[model samples]
Target: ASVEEIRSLFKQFSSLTPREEVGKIEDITIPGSETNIKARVYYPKTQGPYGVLVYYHGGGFVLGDIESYDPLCRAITNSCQCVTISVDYRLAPENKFPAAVVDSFDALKWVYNNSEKFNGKYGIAVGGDSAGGNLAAVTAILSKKENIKLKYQVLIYPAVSFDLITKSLYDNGEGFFLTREHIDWFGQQYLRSFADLLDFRFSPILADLNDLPPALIITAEHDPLRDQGEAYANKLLQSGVQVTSVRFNNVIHGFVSFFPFIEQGRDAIGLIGYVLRKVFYGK
Candidate 1:
């Protein structure tokens, strides 16, 4: 299917998020590659000057947008007590690799530049599930390389590396919601060519893992991307980057977005919210 067709199919699913209350919801435009990007800011119903979390949404970099993840982000908003900024970064098969990468960091920079407006302080964090987690992880590395300090990050069942030889890939490759063939298609949708298969931005585990932010890496035991996410966490820990890798044994990929229909999905976000509170607010 074309990217649009995949997106159309995504639109067919009802969001698990029902209406919820928060401080306020605002639409804003941020600077992006060759144009501006759309973003939504969710300020939890808390006091002023909260820590910020710049979140990216997942769809193999091709299918999701802010609306698709709004419910989960709202869950984060209510639970985390920090202002959550959901970024609508450029998607794939149109923007391709590094485009989403650039937009992710650029959105973070924009948030940094305008912290006071959100009643925020310095030293924010980044997070996302699946491919968004990949972007968040890479942005953390890029931020470190640029001397921009991030408080922490949460990578929920992220796609950290593209190599397909992991034990979990074979064990949970098929019969899962996210199949090997589906992942292969996603890789092709997001990468410009076969040569990009190993690009550090696409396969961040291959890059130097030093000086990155502390991370909470969440993986589903039955996910094909499980080991790669764990491998990245191990790499970060080996490089002296504080890391935690947790697995939801009964779940599969894309669990966080299924909070309304699945118990484990909300459980994962609850864990992420805990990480957010502990890391961001030091509670």
Candidate 2:
């Protein structure tokens, strides 16, 4: 993709992705291993020291920032009754692969260390859409290795495998808003080279899945990412991580971001809220 083409695509992305209006927004910076990382915090009107969700925005780690995901973050915060810290992690073709991986884990560590600011113990969760979901899943794996605890994770139609050769890719790869060409382009921008493609940071499905936190994995049956996302869930379940998998067969990828317009998206958010309340209140 050319520079002009990139700019054009971003314009459409910014224009089309709905921004859910949220109250009580705060902008703050947190420590990243590489450098300082930016974040937007959303606090609900009702509480103090609320449950926390350290969120990452999705643009395949190449295009999105907290600004792009403001609406969704606000929705999650307001709906889940959690203090949402939407991380503006560095992007790709600039910072490249490991930068996002490093920054996401650092943000999680920061959230865990600074848990008192939010209801950290009530339930600290990791979440994101698309590439951000990949980060949440990998971060959960890293958390388990480091023995850091999180109450749950919400992975919204994530791309867990680096290679896009799965059955889903062949079946639903094109004409569903996220084309194979775009996925390939994202991979090209995100990875340093093909040799780095299969590393666990890029393809988290390759990593060991033991002792990870409970997860709610969302998938759209028509999306190219469908198989990999569902495959990761099966791996999680088989590996003993409690899993709740939901597939909205009629929807496409990126369905969660289409709330208030797409019923499936709203349904997914409602389900997320229900799962979140269960995790927090043990209901």
**How badly does each model clash, as a count of residue pairs?**
1, 3
Question: Candidate 1, overall lDDT?
Answer: 0.85
Write one digit per residue (lDDT tens) for candidate 1, span 194-237: 88766888888878988888999999989999999999988998
lDDT of 2 at 40: 88
Report how far residue 267 has shifted in candidate 2, in Å: 1.0
lDDT of model 2 at position 204: 87
Q: List the residue pairs that clash in candidate 2.
A: 20-71, 49-119, 50-119
- Which candidate achieves the best TM-score against the true structure? 1
Stretches of candidate 2 off by over 4 Å are 1-23
Task: Looking at model 1, report the run of 10 residues with the lowest lDDT sum.
Answer: 11-20
Off by over 4 Å in 1: none
Provide TM-scores for the models. 0.95, 0.93
Task: List model 2 lDDT by residue over 1-283, tens digit each.
Answer: 7744764576566666666665588887898889899988887766565678888888878887776677777778767776789998888888898899899999999989988865556868899889999999889889988889999999999989875468989999889999899898888888887777668888889999988889999999899999889999999999999999988889899888878588888889888877886787564
Candidate 1 local Cα displacement, residue 137, angstroms: 0.5
- Once model 1 is optimally superposed onto the true structure by TM-score, how far is the C-alpha of residue 260 displaced, in angstroms? 1.6
